[PDB]
Amino acid sequence: TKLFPKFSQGLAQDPTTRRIWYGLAMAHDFESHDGMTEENLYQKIFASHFGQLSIIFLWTSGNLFHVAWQGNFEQWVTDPVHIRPIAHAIWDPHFGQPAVEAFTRGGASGPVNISTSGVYQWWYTIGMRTNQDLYVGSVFLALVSAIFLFAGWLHLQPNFQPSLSWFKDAESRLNHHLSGLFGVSSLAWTGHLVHVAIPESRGQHVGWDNFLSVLPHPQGLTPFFTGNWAAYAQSPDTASHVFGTAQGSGQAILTFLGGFHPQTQSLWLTDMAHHHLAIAVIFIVAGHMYRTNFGIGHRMQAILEAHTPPSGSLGAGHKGLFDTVNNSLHFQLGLALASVGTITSLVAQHMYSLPPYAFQAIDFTTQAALYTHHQYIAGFIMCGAFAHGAIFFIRDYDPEQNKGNVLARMLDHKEALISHLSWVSLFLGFHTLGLYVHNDVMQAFGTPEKQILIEPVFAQWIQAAHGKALYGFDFLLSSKTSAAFANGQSLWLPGWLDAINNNQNSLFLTIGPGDFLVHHAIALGLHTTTLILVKGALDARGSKLMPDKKDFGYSFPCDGPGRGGTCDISAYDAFYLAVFWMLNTIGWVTFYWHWKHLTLWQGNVAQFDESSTYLMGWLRDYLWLNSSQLINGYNPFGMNSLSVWAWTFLFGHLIYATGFMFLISWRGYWQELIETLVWAHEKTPLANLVYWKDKPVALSIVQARLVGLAHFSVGYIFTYAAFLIASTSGRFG
Amino acid sequence: MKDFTTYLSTAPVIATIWFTFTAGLLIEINRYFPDPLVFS
């Protein structure tokens, strides 16, 4: 039999091409490998994590190297407002001379790509000023990548493999990760800001060669050890400070100004220094909570066992959950993806409205790409969070050990949960779509005053509570007599209120009826996607149509045409259907973010306010209007620098449409077609001398759903990425 | 005639009459009270 795959004898004995495809697709499902034990499972995962870490630091090293080698960082730092950053050089032998000239720009030697990832603003903010600064960082991270790779090898060796119990010491790992991984890293990052980043923003060079002889503050550590910590907040950078120079600069290293630096339109460095110092203290303290070898602290099992409501409303409460969580990796992975997935959305939300990197706001293409980038990644992570929660129920859930606790009771009323999610999705869809169609008919008939425009009073009321005085609610921070206004009036409100009432920045943009409709469409996306994913998990173990679904696994094709038909009945298929709704939801979010910002960046916000209340406005004034430059990247008269995005735009449409083939036409058609191809090859003279070793067959039922979904997603992403960058960059960049 | 009235009681026939009635009522109301947006 064939060697590959070495981890499954069932695959290795398959004489068809399914062996190749399935061998690739089951490589990282360690639990399903032949001869796998629990202890070997954890040691492989530990080794794999070292590999991922080494790739991350190597990928970062490659970015640093190419910007220094081929970028214009040293030129960009001089005039960041009027210089486009360079990502890397182009050496494409297929280029013609017009293409070579078209992509030559920014004073570069030859063709180059413009960066959109914002690394220039990030690196410039944290104190990098020269190409040699980037070169040393690149070599340092390449070395760090090597060390992690060695550690991955080291801990696979006979005397360094941790035992199974080592991976299940929950109290000790939480203490270290909270205090050391989070707390000390944040404390160390405060050291960089106080010692390097802040001085570099004030025109003083601090490097490894002189940082031991430079005083971060004129009073060196006397305020710190004497408790007079307020001395570090005196004489902050003035409003006239020019970033990177000593004119208008101050001396404070810890402040709470609370606003935006007037020139860079980004958060103050002294606030970001005090921010990281504050959480570092909290995280170091929080890391002394759990039991270890020293006789103090909590044991997490005791905490869970205690929290049972005395009235029996939650049944057994949280009894038995410690083993349920501590023994299942899919439960832990589901909690990790759900938490990280939400934080990825939070990063996108807060970075566009509280830009932390100098000159990030004015780079419109970078801001658009960064928000879209992280929202699409958050969407994928959330779908994975529910997928592994569904896998937990099939593989790791033990009904006997979870008898009567909160987890078991979720399955008890799963129909109630699914029924109510179904109602909310239907309600939002009916009325959200209905109002849009009503407004479209009114616009078509020429009566824009007959449409249903509902003021977002609840959201506009929140903005009033934060100090936005436009709506006249005179509430909390919007009223100058409230205690909330008075108490903070000496710490951060003067800066915060100044920024929130500036209508040229993205801090709490003004909202109207156009924002009301879009937000309710977003809710429909979240609820429907949750409905599909939640049903896939709660029904994973069985249903009326298939009472014993657990016996078949997480992913199987179907149960056949009997009992009416069971296509797409597994929990794997519920995730597969939910990915479509995730893309649809994130699409609505990113269209909404992009259109509301393009109108702001052009100064004509009225277009969004007027055209966003009906769906023809989106198609006409957003998709059609902003495609004009994209599709002219190359035309019968020539081409320009946008021809790559024009080409990638159609490239996306093609991959997307190809995915329809794997989703619409199913296996039986193709297997019978391949059988005539097998006949044709064998009877053809001069070709039947050559022969195959793996019998050709059609893709499997499950494989084609993944292959179709992969093409659908890739085409989805590449089409909008090309349009997002091209429309934003051509308009302003 | 009993069978014919039974045929008129079938679901498709009832729905056609019911929605024809329901639609007619709404159309007639908007004919005499054009452009209703607020109860007032």
Added chain:
Amino acid sequence: SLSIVIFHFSWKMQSDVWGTVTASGVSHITGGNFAQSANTINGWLRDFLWAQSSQVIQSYGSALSAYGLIFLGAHFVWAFSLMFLFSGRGYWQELIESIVWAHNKLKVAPAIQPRALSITQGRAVGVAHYLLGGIATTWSFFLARIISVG
């Protein structure tokens, strides 16, 4: 295949045959851009679909505004059909089980047991909506265009 046939006819006629006769000569609706532009996929996207769809998307507020509405509605029906084509009745029968439970809880469950469509009916419902949406989209786009300029 027929969509390309009627796009070929529409662009070729406007570019090379249809037009207004004047003293100097014949000026065509699209000015003879078929020969140089229809040899790339980008040419069809820009010169045919994007440029000529200007009439349909600007129809609101005029007598042709109906074609604008059907242009959007056709786009909707087409995308709606992909729900039936990309899914299978196994998911939907389980979904109806939870929905039926809510009706049973309220003593309002029907006597005719709800069932998800059969496998074949899902494919038939999918293709019928796919065709109606796609064909109606071209229908609105053609008439609003040719009536406006032709």
Added chain:
Amino acid sequence: DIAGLTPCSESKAYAKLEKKELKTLEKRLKQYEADSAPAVALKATMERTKARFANYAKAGLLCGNDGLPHLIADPGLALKYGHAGEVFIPTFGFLYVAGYIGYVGRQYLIAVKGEAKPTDKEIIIDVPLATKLAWQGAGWPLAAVQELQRGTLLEKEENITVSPR
């Protein structure tokens, strides 16, 4: 006014919008005769347009910078400033009709469950019974509440089928 809005009766953009719509209608009018069929139809449209803009201003709606009416949904703000007719009152108008339709259908469904062949009473409607239940539904909120308090609104958990768990 509320949320920075202003009454449509006092809105400059709102007034300008009416002129634009009337101007469009007038432009088409002057290509016909005085009392021809097309001219009469256009004049009728202009009368409805003028009436519509007077009614919305008279109703005391709020117009934004766009000069289009906006609706107030918070019950407190609506009753505070006399906007109850936009969303608040129509909210309880719809629920009465929606509960009427749902309650009537539920009564009919229970009625035929006692018959020998309930399925044949669903494809072939029992019109005499349906009309009887249609009229009695006007008091559904009273009947609906009394069922809830007597405990006959919901089925018992033990009489409802559920999947293995």
Added chain:
Amino acid sequence: AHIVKIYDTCIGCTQCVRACPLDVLEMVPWDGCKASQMASAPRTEDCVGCKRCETACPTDFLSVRVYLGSESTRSMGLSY
């Protein structure tokens, strides 16, 4: 090879055996039902996984179950 299991709810109707298009199943004597016979799966190496047997079983839930497993020339239904 797929896995085919017969459970003790079989009533010996023989419909699964008739339905099978590869002669995988057969009936054997039994004392656990009125028919005094039970379905058997002695030749699962020829099973292709069509699940025609499950379509034909009257009992609820099924008394014959097919669990698709390792693929081969016979189970993949290849003539080449």
Added chain:
Amino acid sequence: WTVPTLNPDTPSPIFGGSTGGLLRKAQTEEFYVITWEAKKEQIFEMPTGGAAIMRQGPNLLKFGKKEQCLALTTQLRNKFKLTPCFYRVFPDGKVQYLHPADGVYPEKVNAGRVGANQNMRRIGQNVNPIKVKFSGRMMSPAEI
């Protein structure tokens, strides 16, 4: 009843031939032979496509996979009320007999058969997947 012995010289039906017949698999892995007795010459439908005339008396056909042989067997039994039997033939010359395994068609109960893959429980009494985890391979709860 005793296991029949295949006769390779048995005459075959009158068939022109088609492109739906045996492939290179028959020469390297295995093929299947079905034989039966015909009361009179008659036209039947080949599972590979087309129509063939069965000679009166013994007939023999060769097919590429087992399902094709048992598809023809169903046609012969249901319509023509015949009693065909087919074998598995290997390239080395070995011949394996099957269907009927014991001479009686499986639909009819016969003494001497031993139950196989019979679980003396219901589907609802299987253990949970967690209890058959790390058993060396992917194992369903039904297997144990």
Added chain:
Amino acid sequence: EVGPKRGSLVKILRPESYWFNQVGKVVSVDQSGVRYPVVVRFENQNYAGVTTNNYALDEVVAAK
């Protein structure tokens, strides 16, 4: 003398049955000591179109 009376109504308790927690009419009860003697008929068919099934003595209880 074993099982419920013919024609009486019973409630099904087999969790894997389509008619779990539902009422059906007893058609006959086998007295030969078979595994599942009780035969029950239902007015609503299951997903396969069947309306009858066999149950053990302890899987069925009298209506209420």
